[PDB]
Write a protein that binds this ligand. Structure first.
Ligand SMILES: c1cc(Nc2ccc(NC3=NCCN3)cc2)ccc1NC1=NCCN1
Ligand SMILES: c1cc(Nc2ccc(NC3=NCCN3)cc2)ccc1NC1=NCCN1
Lengths: 248, 248
DNA sequence: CTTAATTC
DNA sequence: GAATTAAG
DNA sequence: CTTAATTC
DNA sequence: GAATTAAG
């Protein structure tokens, strides 16, 4: 049973993740950037009640923390919280787009490797810590009418909605899986941010490779979705494609 | 007095023109063209009364004649008659656009020739006969409530609104003024359909050249506007430009 | 909700 | 220039 | 007036 | 997709 032998690797049984080998991320700003404070547009009670449980969970997990920041961006009034970070994105220095587009990424999958395992990492961005000096950039307001917290909250992990999160996560995971690639020269490993494809020449190589990948991911602090996992199959769904016997 | 010595050349004193040296024009149709009969949109009495005098004059001049044709195009309901020949234009074979654009035409005016005469020919298109086989193409309806003519009328001369009239006229006049150019090698003659510019090196050459041009135009059957004529000047208006001492 | 594209 | 649409 | 472009 | 505009 894949789930039982790798408890630490699955999001269902290993608790929230944290990439312990990765230094907290520093987010450089453009040379002329100055903090921007966008007022929170009034949010209906319906929306606040819908969002509330999620904010509480994130606070309990330490992913969100109180703060006082010169920066402030809106949470969408219309549940799961979505922060409009466009004004912060505009002020952050650009980085080279290193994530390959799916078409090019899949071009590196040879017909020799037809046994596949597809894993997707749960709450991947939240596994990467944000350095305290960069945390203020992502603050937003949170008020609980019937006695709430300070005023603002911010993320201690790489947040959703930030323009560089996909690239920074893809780069971080590449650094953490570099050794795995070296130890398994005969396996193909495709990475598209939080979506992983492991390809082997035989069902055996795939089983052994998948065990090694799960163990490595778990030890590194990442968590894969056991519910969505596709293990050692000859046909899998990956990045919108149906991979079947070398096709696509 | 320029007007008195060349009575035949001016529209004011020579009567309507007729290019006697030019054979009646035959207008070739496209290979798949079939006659089109567009019904005349009702015309208000105000419009008909405004147009009436012009139709009568043209009939008296023989430029318009009664006819029965499979072709019919509209006269605009909203004075001076304007015929919508777009559907006829679409069915007429295209010819090469040989009239030079004003910019290029003026590029052939050297600074050596700074004495100018500008003439514009009155009702130029009407000076060119249309062959009877092509006359039917341009028919339109004309009804006079208080007892009128047959039903349709058509042109016996090159009409306004026809896509090839400017080009055909420019080509016809070029053929008629070819000899003049040969007899006056030291004069510059620019032709833009009905707008003519004669340039000479001295006021004398311009006077003599202008006399010769007027006499030639008159004999050929063309008529120039005495009212608008600009004779032997060092500054003239031509094709939207102010020609002054070699400039423009 | 707000901001910018793409359509109509 | 307003209706749809896409995306933070 | 009808037909097709260019703007908004 | 409607308002302006251009042209027969
Ligand atoms: C994709 C599809 C559409 N589709 C659309 C369909 C019908 C109408 N109909 C209409 N307009 C006026 C009257 N009636 C207008 C738009 C628009 C933008 C994006 N792409 C995109 N948006 C933001 C970023 N990228
Ligand atoms: C030249 C100029 C314009 N000018 C124009 C100005 C203001 C509006 N304003 C508006 N539209 C919608 C609401 N308000 C629309 C059009 C249009 C076509 C041509 N050119 C041309 N026509 C036929 C052939 N060539």
């Amino acid at each position: 049973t894949w789930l039982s032998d790798f408890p630490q690797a699955w999001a269902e049984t290993g608790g929230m993740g944290l990439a312990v080998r990765q230094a907290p991320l520093i987010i450089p700003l453009k040379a002329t950037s100055t903090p921007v404070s966008i007022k929170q547009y009034p949010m209906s009670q319906e929306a606040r009640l819908g969002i509330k449980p999620h904010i509480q969970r994130l606070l309990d997990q330490g992913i969100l923390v109180p703060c006082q920041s010169p920066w402030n961006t809106p949470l969408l009034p219309v549940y799961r919280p979505v922060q409009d970070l466009r004004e912060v994105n505009k002020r952050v220095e650009d980085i080279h787009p290193t994530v390959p587009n799916p078409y090019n990424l899949l071009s590196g999958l040879p017909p020799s490797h037809q046994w596949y395992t597809v894993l997707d990492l749960k709450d991947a961005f939240f596994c990467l810590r944000l350095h305290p000096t960069s945390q203020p950039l992502f603050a937003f307001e949170w008020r609980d009418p019937e006695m709430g917290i300070s005023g603002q909250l911010t993320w201690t992990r790489l947040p959703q909605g930030f323009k560089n999160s996909p690239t920074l996560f893809d780069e971080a995971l590449h650094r953490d899986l570099a050794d795995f690639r070296i130890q398994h020269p005969d396996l193909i490993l495709l990475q598209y941010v939080d979506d992983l494809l492991l390809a082997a020449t035989s069902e055996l190589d795939c089983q052994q490779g998948t065990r090694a990948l799960l163990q490595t991911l778990g030890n590194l602090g990442y968590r894969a979705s056991a519910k969505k996992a596709q293990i050692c199959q000859k046909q899998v769904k990956y990045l919108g494609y149906l991979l079947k016997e070398g096709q696509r």
